[PDB]
Paper text:
We crystallised the dimeric form of Olfm1coil-Olf, after deglycosylation with Endo-H, with calcium chloride present in the buffer. The β-propellers in the Z isoforms are covalently dimerised by an inter-chain disulfide bond (formed by Cys221-Cys221) at the C-terminus of the preceding coiled-coil domain. Only about a third of this recombinant Olfm1coil-Olf sample formed disulfide-linked dimers as in the crystal structure, yet the monomeric and dimeric fractions could be separated from each other by two rounds of SEC (see Materials and methods section for details). In the calcium-bound state the top face still consists of conserved residues and is devoid of glycans. Another putative region of interaction is the crevice between the two Olf domains, flanked by β-propeller blades 4 and 5.
Olfactomedin-1 (Olfm1; also known as Noelin or Pancortin) is a highly-expressed secreted brain and retina protein and its four isoforms have different roles in nervous system development and function. Structural studies showed that the long Olfm1 isoform BMZ forms a disulfide-linked tetramer with a V-shaped architecture.
Residue numbers in the entry:
A (entry chain A): 212 to 479
B (entry chain B): 212 to 477
């Protein structure tokens, strides 16, 4: 049981490569307000296709849980979980059964276990801005963006000591301690969103109109480059874009729609 | 236990990289004739540190088994296994309990199970040269060279349809079928020795003198480049150079000496 998860994690790392393409988005659902996030747990056991869904970016503490991806498309059946604190932004992630989010109007990260419904850890992000200071271009208190890739848990934010440029920190999923930190050269307020695939942070140019990935920072070498990978902004406003390594897709909240993007990675 | 093997094979592939260096050799044993091969199974279970030893490039069918590396260094304590046919060259490999070798005066490959002492599979290598035809630069009927890396079992040889240039084939360890073939443009006669690391074939400039790895063929892209990775030829003649994925080292038969090189990957 434990060796299977160790093996699948190794297989994912072996199939890693540079982002070369983003296919056309599929519309999974039309629901919610203009802003929000949705996601699945890439470390979910066999079965367990539960979709987690958080509407809005402010003073909403209710998380919806859908049974599966198909029940998320066609039905409105769900159970609601009340978080002890409201989240800020749409930067939450669900990882190995716990939801990680930014506490409302703070730089505090909270790990909340979804089965027993209890706070497991609370830790402030050192020098991270908050309260619409280093938001993504679309605003909405998106100062801190937590995400998961083939390597584990990550925090994307910005600090005053870095002139408001994006900072990447690898997090420990249990202690929430910063294991390593990279200073990028990209202003977080000028990015429309960001996502990490295989240790590489990809940053988009904006949130409306003709969007593209145009900056990549490689953490394995602390190098960066400007690129041009366009993707279709089907409903013209994107407020959430995150990669899921289990199904190699970007999850997006797009102007009151929930959409999915297949990605292409380089494989010799 | 099967997933432990499956997880370890994944971990090895994930730790792969480009060859960047070869350390100074260490002389493990002084024995044997001018030509031969020695190796360990990269897929031996824990507790199996057996060293396998084959003296000569012809007229010998007796494989020696030593208990461990330390018994190989300091003792002459070994068991003899008599193969059903003599081997050709020094390009044998031991892999997951079987020995793979080229049968004397033929291009046939034989998989021989060591514990049951049984031939498990026989198959002619397709279009491969034999009998001192497309040998390495040192000769010794080394027409066909079987090797193992992180990805499994390989066969390096030359064909006439490839104008005498090195051909690489990935083999199935059970059926001995050719899964995929790559045509290089490196003339096998000019190759001193060759070995595969992480799907890349490395070819040395000679079996003698100031030896150097100077050619790398990347099978993941069918491209090649010229490199410069010098290593010391302690005893002036090398009849065997094999990579072992488990210990990240090169095993060599250096003119009656058995030596080991550590490799550095990127
Ligand atoms: C919602 O759930 C109820 C009870 O669990 C079930 O009877 C009903 O069919 C479900 N509706 C949909 C649309 O899935
Ligand atoms: C996921 O959680 C289980 C127990 O709930 C733990 O044993 C396991 O190590 C965790 N996996 C990771 C990758 O942290
Ligand atoms: C990032 O920048 C801050 C302040 O500019 C500095 O204290 C820290 O050492 C930097 N870290 C790296 C990895 O460059
Ligand atoms: C991604 O590709 C898979 C298989 O090619 C397909 O089943 C799935 O529908 C695709 N999803 C998107 C959003 O393109
Ligand atoms: C071989 O092993 C025996 C005992 O098993 C020992 O007495 C003998 O000395 C060993 N051979 C050598 C060359 O040391
Ligand atoms: C090694 O041999 C065993 C037979 O005992 C087999 O089950 C296993 O799959 C083999 N391993 C490889 C990598 O071929
Ligand atoms: C290699 O060359 C032979 C003949 O020269 C040809 O039949 C074969 O298809 C070639 N293989 C590849 C992979 O190019
Ligand atoms: C190779 O490296 C290992 C560990 O660094 C060491 O124990 C061994 O002696 C080295 N062997 C050679 C031949 O340098
Ligand atoms: C999308 As806004 C101006 O409420 O941060
Ligand atoms: Ca994101
Ligand atoms: Ca060799
Ligand atoms: Na996120
Ligand atoms: Na060999």
């Amino acid at each position: 049981s434990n060796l299977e998860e160790r093996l699948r994690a190794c297989m994912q790392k072996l199939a890693c490569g540079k982002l070369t393409g983003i296919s056309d988005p599929v519309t999974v659902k039309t629901s919610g307000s203009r802003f929000g996030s949705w996601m699945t747990d890439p470390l979910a056991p066999e079965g367990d296709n539960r979709v987690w869904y958080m509407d809005g970016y402010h003073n909403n503490r209710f998380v919806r849980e859908y049974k599966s991806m198909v029940d998320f498309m066609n039905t409105d059946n769900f159970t609601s979980h009340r978080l002890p604190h409201p989240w800020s932004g749409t930067g939450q992630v669900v990882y190995n059964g716990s939801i990680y989010f930014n506490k409302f109007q703070s730089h505090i990260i909270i790990r909340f276990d979804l089965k027993t419904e209890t706070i497991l850890k609370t830790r402030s992000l050192d020098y991270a801005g908050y309260n619409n200071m280093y938001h993504y271009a679309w605003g909405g208190h998106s100062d801190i963006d937590l995400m998961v890739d083939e390597n584990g848990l990550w925090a994307v934010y910005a600090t005053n000591q870095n002139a408001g440029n994006i900072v990447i920190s690898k997090l420990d999923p249990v202690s929430l301690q910063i294991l390593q930190t990279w200073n990028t050269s990209y202003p977080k307020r000028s990015a429309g969103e960001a996502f990490i695939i295989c240790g590489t942070l990809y940053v988009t140019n904006g949130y409306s109109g003709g969007t593209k990935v145009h900056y990549a920072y490689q953490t394995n070498a602390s190098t960066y480059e400007y690129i041009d990978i366009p993707f279709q902004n089907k409903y013209s406003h994107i407020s959430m874009l995150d990669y899921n390594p289990k199904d190699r897709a970007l999850y997006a909240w797009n102007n009151g729609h929930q959409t999915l993007y297949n990605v292409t990675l380089f494989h010799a």
